[PDB]
Design a binder for this molecule. Sequence first.
Ligand SMILES: CCCCCCCCCCCCCC
Lengths: 100, 168, 62, 341, 446, 53, 115
Amino acid sequence: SLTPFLRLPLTDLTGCLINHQTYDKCGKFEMKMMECFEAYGLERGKRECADLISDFQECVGMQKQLMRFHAMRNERYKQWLKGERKGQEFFADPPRVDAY
Amino acid sequence: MSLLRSKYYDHPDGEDAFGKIVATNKYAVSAGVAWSMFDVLTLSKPQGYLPTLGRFAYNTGPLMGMATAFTLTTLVATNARGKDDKINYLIGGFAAGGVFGAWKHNHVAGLCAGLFLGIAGVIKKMSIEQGWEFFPNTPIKQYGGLNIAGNDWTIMADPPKNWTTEKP
Amino acid sequence: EKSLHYLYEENEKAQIRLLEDEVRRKMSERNDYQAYYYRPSVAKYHRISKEAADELEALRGD
Amino acid sequence: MFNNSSKILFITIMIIGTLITVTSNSWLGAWMGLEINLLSFIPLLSDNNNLMSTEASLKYFLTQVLASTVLLFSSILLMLKNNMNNEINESFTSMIIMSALLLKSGAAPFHFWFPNMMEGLTWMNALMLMTWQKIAPLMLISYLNIKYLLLISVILSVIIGAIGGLNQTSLRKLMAFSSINHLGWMLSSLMISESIWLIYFFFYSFLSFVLTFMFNIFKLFHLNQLFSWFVNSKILKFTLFMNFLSLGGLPPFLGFLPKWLVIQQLTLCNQYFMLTLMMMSTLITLFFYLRICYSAFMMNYFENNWIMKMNMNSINYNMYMIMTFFSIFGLFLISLFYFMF
Amino acid sequence: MLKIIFFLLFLIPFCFINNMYWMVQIMMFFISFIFLLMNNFMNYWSEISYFLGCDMLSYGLILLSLWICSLMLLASEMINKHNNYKNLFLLNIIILLLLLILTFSSMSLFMFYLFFESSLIPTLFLILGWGYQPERLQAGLYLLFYTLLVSLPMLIGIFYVMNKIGSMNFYLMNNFMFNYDLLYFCLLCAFLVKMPMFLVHLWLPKAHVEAPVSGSMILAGIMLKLGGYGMLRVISFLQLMNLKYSFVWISISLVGGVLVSLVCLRQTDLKALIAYSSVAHMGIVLSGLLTMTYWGLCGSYTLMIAHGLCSSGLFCLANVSYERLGSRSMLINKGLLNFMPSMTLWWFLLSSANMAAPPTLNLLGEISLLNSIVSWSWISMILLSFLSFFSAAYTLYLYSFSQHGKLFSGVYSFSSGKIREYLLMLLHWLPLNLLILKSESFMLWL
Amino acid sequence: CYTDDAVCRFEADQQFRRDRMVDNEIVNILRQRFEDCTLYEAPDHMVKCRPLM
Amino acid sequence: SAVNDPLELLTNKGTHEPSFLSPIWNPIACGVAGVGAAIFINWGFRKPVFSGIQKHIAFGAIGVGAGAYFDQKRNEYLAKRDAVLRHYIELHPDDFPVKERKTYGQVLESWVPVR
Ligand SMILES: CCCCCCCCCCCCCC
């Protein structure tokens, strides 16, 4: 997170505006990152919390998961265009709707 | 990852030619396109599709002439004598001033600009051989005065933290 | 001897100024101390919102 | 402020919105504080008996609304890519945030609204525009560690704000171009030390706040109104015009001190070339300061004959002469200060 | 130097009391008397109290500045009779005297820089307020901008030296030495413009012709000596870069002073010819400084003090004849011996002092500054002989054409010489002939 | 003397200056001895003043 | 001292006696500034300079009180600054080590001769 410059009582309302602590799956990870952002600081936290920043980033931004999914989808269509994948067996078996 | 993504000082001076031409013309392209973008809308509006590109070429192409003439003059002066020094950059600045004089049809501008760009060249050569940097990364960056931790004035109470300095 | 005393005072002031220049350079290089170059970030508001969401779980119902 | 208590209410919501902006730990709270500040500053600067004040308010509105929407756009993009409030490594969306902040602050090359709008104002709203409305965008620039874009803004601001102020003989546009030139010294201090920026801003606002009072009381909207300005003693006009040499950075006045602390902190942080570029800039600023100083330094003028007595407010001229003393003999307080250690 | 500074600080409220102009002059001459009795200074820094102290160099410079400012009040009587803001003029003189004492009593270089830039403001006030021509605005702007354009990067040099050494004290900075070209150019170009080199002189005749005598004397007698005293402080730790880059400044400052001396032969203005005369002799001073010999520094300081005295004395004569003849030139002021015969004695006694006058301190400064230039190289002999020959060619043309020949036959009746003017001319000449008996206080600063 | 010490560089510089002064009137006194040899041996200074030279 | 220890360099032993103007200069300068400000107010309103001495006395008292208070705040600020510098030196002794003092008898610098 950022820092309050010349901080006053007026930042107490602003500080709780957008955060992941309210019933989100990622917020505990965010909380851990905030823990070292309270310990190391905002400037040492950019270097000594590279593991905790990236876990929160690909937990709420879902960058690596969506790149993985788009690599899984593009390879199947690439195999269909190259002729290795038959058009009848192009898609696999669907999941149950009660699953997930 | 191409020949366009090259710098002027990626090689020693006089060793490489085309990368230096591409780099110095790239700064010439950036300066000319920026000045012509703040030119053709703001003062002397061309009011046409073709005179706008004409003003773009007028503000861009002589800067390519400056860059190419300075780099070729520095390359010739480096390949002529064994030693590399400052007056190669001085005569390259005079060649760029002569290009300015050919642009503006005024010899006096060509000389004065040659003297100014030669002074700029010898100062840049002093920078590259003495090791100091024109715009270095800032070593000392004050984010506040003393007691930046001690002037937290907030009315809400702090909940107890989840981190300790104590070793387990 | 007044020149000797003033030279001793100015030489010690120059030495302390050089020492504090190296101390400030090493402090701003690594952001180690809380005083000068520390940009403070607090996890107070995240803990406040998580605590408020924890009290709001008890008040859900009818 | 003047003639209404609702203007005091607008000043109160102005202070509230700016202090909401600068204390925000998120870009969205800073953005809504800028919305509150814009809401507060539209009604001051609007007057239906002035045909150009409404046009100045429209120019301010269009410039701030365009700059606030780009600021929210790149803030949302920063939250989209790097999901915290800041960015670990600098990228282009930080440059878009900095550019949208530079349009609010009035720095070059996004400076063009600022002296073109200052012709439509009074002097008190000019002082609120070029001092307090530069609190919120300049303090938000401090969160961004960008060197090339800030350096380009510094060089362009000190080049243009010195060169551009030579042509105008109107005092409002000249003082706006002076505020553009002093903005470059603030932005040059913004990437070495935030405290040194605060000190340069406080002393620049002090010198602005004492030079506004000489123009607000006597209604000096032009350069030759200074030459026709009547004083009961020419030594008093000689002393009152020393604040322009203070704002030009000439020692031993007070305004040498913030420029000097910026130069000292820049040389400690190993910047020398843009400091030398700002040496040549402030000579031109001192040059168009001296055309005002022609009106008091020659000690005798061919003056208009009909006016015989000068008139001033009580409390405004009482508060003016406290600070004119400290804008001349302010370097005797160099031992009292303890911020710079 | 706290007693002198507090003496002038409580001499400040005499400006606001009316009819006290000559009282301020009397007490400033009393300051000069006390400062004559304060001489005990040697090589190092003595009488140290709250960052203030002096060596023999700074003692002579403060004594010269005090003598020039007291004479300047004696010189400026047209302020008193016309009541042309005499209180503001007195306050400007006393504040500028405080600033010049404070920039000469500086133990660290940054007080020298700070009060050196502070001293530009009352001189600019004197130019813009107490001149007589419409080109006052061209004069003070040239002075202010030619000083400031080169004195602003020297602040960056000062902070570069401070970070490297950590202090600005002149003895602690003597130990170190630097091999940076741009640091040398910053620490030299401000003094190279402030005391006029031939390529950068321009501001000097514009500032001198326009300026009032109380304003031309502080530009001729002192405030070119700031640009010599600055090099006397700075060249101690930049000896290697000075040996790298002296020859261009010695060549420029020796060709100028011949070209400058040929300029004065082809000029008709009386105040402009002394203005270019300040360039030629401090061309010798500038040539002798950048040769780091012991005789060069000693004779340079001697010619600074003595040339300041004789140039201020020569600018005293150019305002006596100006206020009687309405406007000064060679053509109007031709042959003033038949008008003022007793003024002609001081005219020759101070115009001869501008060249080599035999028992004066100008010759003793010149005879030892030629020693360093001759010992530096033998090529410099050709352009020194022409320099001194053309120097006494022009400075004898001043007295020669202004004080001999037929009258103008178009002038009106003016007042004769007074007791004030002869006393003013005496205190510029007899210090030039009386300090040679103890010239070691004006030779040996080391 | 040490590198950072300035209280002892002042004393060493002052005794260096004083020794330079002392040697200056050593050479000056020897020159006056040669000149007094030249005046006192007015027709025969080519023999008596050669060792003093 | 054969070594230049930063702990021994920074620790105030007490051999530096403060000057006569050291506790008194800021209140008298701020009082002179307040008296001059009231004089400047009376001059600009075309009053006599010493007409209203109530303003002179009030401005002088405000100046002396503000000078004493901010001089005390300055003294605690400088004490905390040197405490911060000392604690940072003891926190990282590897980056600020004990250096051996090296005399001129072991150093060959390049002298610069003129000729
Ligand atoms: C006009 C005179 C103002 C000063 C009066 C004396 C003030 C003395 C210093 C303040 C008290 C210090 C106590 C330690």
